[PDB]
């Protein structure tokens, strides 16, 4: 891959029923809690966490890379405070794909002062195909997807050096 066009598929503002403005101190930008610029971390709004739904038909004109996370809380407490109801799940599907993942919970060593974890997955969404998310919690959503613009023999070079 030689180029990407970054498309806004599922805009932050389109979830009126959940809290999209949450962040963490592990992503902190100059002391202030932040999060992945390309992701939305959904939490309860008004003590409720209604089913979250989103879909994208691909009008981009080319294939699109899409990524989503699922949050794995440190304890049942965290699960409740964040997503309210337990026994949650995250569902993604397309012409070819199926996943319903459940939030594995384990007490883990603090990493970045964080016992929770986020498991991300990706897929290639074909032209004219459609992606479906629905979840009752622990869903880290894409606000974006990457359309493949230019294609070609290329590579990833591992070096400590700089561009002259």
């Amino acid at each position, epitope marked *: 891959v030689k180029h990407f066009e970054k498309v806004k598929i599922l805009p932050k503002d389109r979830w009126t029923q959940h*809290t999209t*403005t*949450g*962040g*963490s*101190r*592990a992503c*902190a930008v100059s*002391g*202030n*809690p932040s999060f992945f610029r390309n992701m939305v971390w959904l*939490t*309860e*709004k008004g*003590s409720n966490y209604p089913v979250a739904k989103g879909s994208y038909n691909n009008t981009s004109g080319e294939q699109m890379l899409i990524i989503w996370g699922v949050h794995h*809380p*440190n*304890d049942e*407490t*965290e699960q*409740r*405070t*964040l997503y309210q109801n337990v026994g949650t799940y995250v569902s993604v599907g397309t012409s070819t794909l199926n996943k319903r993942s459940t939030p594995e919970i384990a007490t883990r060593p603090k990493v970045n*002062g*964080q*016992g*929770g974890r986020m498991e991300f997955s990706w897929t290639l969404l074909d032209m004219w195909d459609t992606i479906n998310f629905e979840s009752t919690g622990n869903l880290i959503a894409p606000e974006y997807g990457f359309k493949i613009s230019k294609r070609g023999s290329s590579g990833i070079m591992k070096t400590e050096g700089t561009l002259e």
Partner: antibody
Amino acid sequence: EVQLVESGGGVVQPGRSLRLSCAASGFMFSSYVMHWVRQPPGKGLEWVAVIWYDGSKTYFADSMRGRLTVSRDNSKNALYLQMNRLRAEDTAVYYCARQQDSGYSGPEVSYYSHYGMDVWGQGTMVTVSS
Amino acid sequence: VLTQSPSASGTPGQAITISCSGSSSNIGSNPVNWYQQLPGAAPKLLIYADEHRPSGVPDRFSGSKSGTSASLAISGLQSEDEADYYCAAWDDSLSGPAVVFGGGTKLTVLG
């Protein structure tokens, strides 16, 4: 070496006003919603106020209506309390405490409500007399 | 305001239990934390969100809540355990949201 140190305490005359600070160290201040709570001298504890990590929202005790300004300077690791029209009741030790969260920071109280106050200062004593 | 037993006492090796009670507003809705203040000094959090203890806290201590009441327990007793004990819970009252503290409890190890 995570700690908070309260200063500004002393004697204040009733009808006048009091100004107090708290110095945070050994941790990231701006990610933590912070607390003011006082213990009258030999009696129990009284919640005073709370200020959000980003300073976006404040909540005051019903006791504190109209007398209270609470502010914070994140870059200075500073907590600021200013209280007007004092009295004998307001005489007490004053405490700056840190509200604990999961990893997570957000606008709703629903998050923090499950937790609370994992670190305190040694306080600063206030006595009200003319 | 919340409410607790006036005072308590027990023996080394003994297990003792202190209670906290309050409105549907606070405890009924929001959960409870427990703080411990040793004499001449400042508070330190004993328990958070009902059952859960923080790090650095011995196992003998542990607690719970049901309905609008909550409870705290020490399974075995050392001289170090002599202090004042406070239940605390968020309210979500009107006027506005607010933290609320129990009056207090003092216990004695009887040394």
